[PDB]
Amino acid sequence: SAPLLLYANRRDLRLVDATNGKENATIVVGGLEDAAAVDFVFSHGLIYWSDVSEEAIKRTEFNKTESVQNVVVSGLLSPDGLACDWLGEKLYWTDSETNRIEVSNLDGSLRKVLFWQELDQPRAIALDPSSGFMYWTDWGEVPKIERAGMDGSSRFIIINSEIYWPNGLTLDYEEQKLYWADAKLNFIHKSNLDGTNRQAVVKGSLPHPFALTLFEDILYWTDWSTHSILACNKYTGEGLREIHSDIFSPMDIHAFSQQRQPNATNPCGIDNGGCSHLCLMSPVKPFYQCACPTGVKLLENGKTCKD
Amino acid sequence: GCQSNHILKHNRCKQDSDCLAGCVCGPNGFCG
Ligand SMILES: *[C@@H]1O[C@H](CO[C@@H]2O[C@@H](C)[C@@H](O)[C@@H](O)[C@@H]2O)[C@@H](O[C@@H]2O[C@H](CO)[C@@H](O[C@H]3O[C@H](CO)[C@@H](O)[C@H](O)[C@@H]3O)[C@H](O)[C@H]2NC(C)=O)[C@H](O[C@@H]2O[C@@H](C)[C@@H](O)[C@@H](O)[C@@H]2O)[C@H]1NC(C)=O
Ligand SMILES: *[C@@H]1O[C@H](CO[C@@H]2O[C@@H](C)[C@@H](O)[C@@H](O)[C@@H]2O)[C@@H](O[C@@H]2O[C@H](CO)[C@@H](O[C@H]3O[C@H](CO)[C@@H](O)[C@H](O)[C@@H]3O)[C@H](O)[C@H]2NC(C)=O)[C@H](O[C@@H]2O[C@@H](C)[C@@H](O)[C@@H](O)[C@@H]2O)[C@H]1NC(C)=O
Ligand code: NA
Ligand code: NA
């Protein structure tokens, strides 16, 4: 029951079968320069990626025959991480040169800067859309893991000790756990979603992990120095093994499955929450929050932007 | 190590000078 694994590889995006990892990975899209971040919206048949050399986030329709690459967001100086909100239908990303976290619609419209302070080397970003929380890492001068509302609210640091290069970050939606990989301290740890009850999973000897994902009882990650995809048990850290090797330059990775984007009700309902522009997920009732593009004022009714 | 944690800086390279001091630009175009 292992999944397909979707990963960026700088020059292309690939899919590999975690049950037949020895076999050749299939190319999803090619002709890329430095594809780094990757994510998907399974029910929409979309795969997204960042290309840090083309300074863009792009998408492709993976259920269509034609393999088309459409630019969604451009002018991104270093888009090191992205996440797809499959519930509110939004695109989130980090930029480690402009030091920002930003959101837009799935087509790149209505861009809004959410955070632009106290960031240095923001990197991974993961979402819990049905709870309205976003999580990210920063491996800069103050390395940390943070969480906030997907609406930009209640930003808090949840991990800031025993941490240096937090590259990989994912969520276990069945167990309600956060997992991350630190490429300088060479481990994988987990905690509750507020950072409490931190536990080691893989204690050491991970030479340079970059990205981490999860499916059922198995963790999967990419490692820059081994040029490979590894797997282990998500509870014990045992059964450590190499899924797929001799990868050109492995980058971001996901378990590619509808089951990793569980169906839920969008609290915005059928009318975009009455929001004129953005209807973002939020961690407090009524669990959505209207928002406007960068610099645009939200009126006092909390729904309408000033056009 | 010679392995940078940046996606481009000191990672991608053309000449040894694009790499951290004492590191080399390998045949695949990456510092090492
Ligand atoms: C949208 O794409 C889904 C993913 O397809 C995979 O990824 C893309 C990029 C491409 O490389 C595909 O070639 C690749 O499969 C697709 O779901 C995948 O569908 C296949 C069947 O076409 C499933 O495989 C089956 O294999 C045997 C067949 O006898 C069975 O024993 C299995 O139990 C299984 O049914 C894959 O499991 C499935 N992958 C995932 C991750 O779900 C999807 O197809 C639709 O869903 C599946 C579950 C079936 O209902 C298909 O009939 C559907 O077409 C596709 N959707 C559309 C609308 O095209
Ligand atoms: C998770 O499932 C929700 C329940 O729907 C089921 O799942 C899918 C297969 C859906 O196609 C339904 O057929 C099925 O019963 C789903 O909420 C449903 O979304 C649809 C639109 O995709 C809504 O559609 C009819 O409603 C209006 C009413 O005026 C009609 O005018 C439209 O023409 C449309 O046909 C349903 O109302 C809605 N059901 C409920 C109970 O809310 C849900 O979609 C997400 O949430 C809803 C509220 C909307 O915001 C959707 O746009 C969201 O995608 C689905 N989640 C995801 C992430 O897909
Ligand atoms: Na920076
Ligand atoms: Na992510």
Strand order in the sheet with A4-8: A70-74, A56-61, A46-51, A26-41, A10-17, A4-8, A253-256
Q: Can you tell me the distance from the alpha carbon of A69 to that of A30, in angstroms, rounded to the nearest whole number?
A: 9
Residues 6+ positions from A13 with CB-CB distance below 8 Å:
A6, A7, A27, A28, A29, A32, A35, A38, A47, A49
Q: How many other CB atoms sit within 10 Å of the CB of residue A95?
A: 24
Strand order in the sheet with A122-128: A122-128, A133-138, A144-149, A156-159
Phi-psi region of A102 (alpha: psi -120 to 50; beta: other; left: phi over 0): beta
Q: Let me know the angle formed at the C-alpha of A102 by A5 and A63, rounded to the nearest 5 degrees.
A: 35
Q: Can you tell me the distance from the alpha carbon of A101 to that of A158, in angstroms, rounded to the nearest whole number?
A: 17
Is the CB of residue A36 less than 8 Å away from at least one CB of chain B? yes
Q: Can you tell me the distance from the alpha carbon of B18 to that of A91, in angstroms, rounded to the nearest whole number?
A: 33
Residue located via tokens 């899924």: A243
Amino acid, res. A159: I
Instruction: Locate all alpha helices (DSSP H) within A1-135, ordered by sequence.
Output: none
**3-state secondary structure (DSSP) of residue A129:** coil
Q: How many other CB atoms sit within 10 Å of the CB of residue A43?
A: 11
Residue located via tokens 């960026």: A8
Residue located via tokens 């819990």: A128
Instruction: Tally the C-alpha atoms within 13 A of residue A110's C-alpha that lie toward its C-beta.
Output: 19
Element (H, E) at A59: strand A56-61
Question: How far is A210 from chain B, CA to nearest CA, in Å?
Answer: 9
From the CA of A8, which ligand is nearest? Answer: 4
Ligand 1 atom nearest to CA at A26: 11
For residue A190, give the nearest of A210, A219, A153 by alpha carbon.
A219
In B, which residues are within 8 Å of A49 by CB distance?
Answer: none
Counted residue by residue, chain A has a size of 307
- In the 8-state DSSP scheme, what is residue A258? G
Residues 6+ positions from A111 with CB-CB distance below 8 Å:
A73, A102, A103, A104, A293, A294
Structure tokens at A60: 């492709």
CA A70 → CA A107, A161, A269, distances in Å?
Answer: 9, 40, 28
Burial per residue of A106-118, b for 16 or more beta-carbon CB atoms within 10 angstroms, e otherwise = bebebebebbeee
Boundaries of every domain in chain B:
1-32
Cα A92 to averaged position of ligand 1 atoms, centre (Å): 27
Instruction: Tally the C-alpha atoms within 13 A of residue A233's C-alpha that lie toward its C-beta.
Output: 5
Pairing outcome for strands A26-41 and A46-51 = antiparallel
**Of B3, B8, B30, which has the smallest distance from its Cβ to A208's Cβ?**
B3
Q: Can you tell me the distance from the alpha carbon of A41 to that of A261, in angstroms, rounded to the nearest whole number?
A: 8
Structure tokens at A25: 């990975």
- In the 8-state DSSP scheme, what is residue B30? B
Residue located via tokens 């510092």: B31
Q: How many other CB atoms sit within 10 Å of the CB of residue A63?
A: 8
Q: Let me know the angle formed at the C-alpha of A231 by A131 and B8, rounded to the nearest 5 degrees.
A: 80
Asked if residue A286 has a cis previous peptide bond (ω within 30° of 0), the answer is: yes
Instruction: State the first-to-last Cα distance of chain A, in angstroms, to the nearest integer.
Output: 50
Contact A13, A49 (CB under 8 A): yes
Q: Can you tell me the distance from the alpha carbon of A238 to that of A200, in angstroms, rounded to the nearest whole number?
A: 12
Pairing outcome for strands A56-61 and A70-74 = antiparallel
Q: Can you tell me the distance from the alpha carbon of A14 to that of A79, in angstroms, rounded to the nearest whole number?
A: 19
User: Mutate which of B2, B3, B5 to test chain A, going by most A C-beta atoms within 10 A?
Assistant: B5
**Of B5, B7, B28, which has the smallest distance from its Cβ to A36's Cβ?**
B7
Q: Can you tell me the distance from the alpha carbon of A151 to that of A201, in angstroms, rounded to the nearest whole number?
A: 31
**3-state secondary structure (DSSP) of residue A243:** strand
Q: Can you tell me the distance from the alpha carbon of A94 to that of A285, in angstroms, rounded to the nearest whole number?
A: 26
Residue located via tokens 């932007």: A305
For A199, phi then psi, to 5°, come to -135, 145
Structure tokens at A231: 């797997």
Structure tokens at A199: 């536990």
Amino acid, res. A282: S
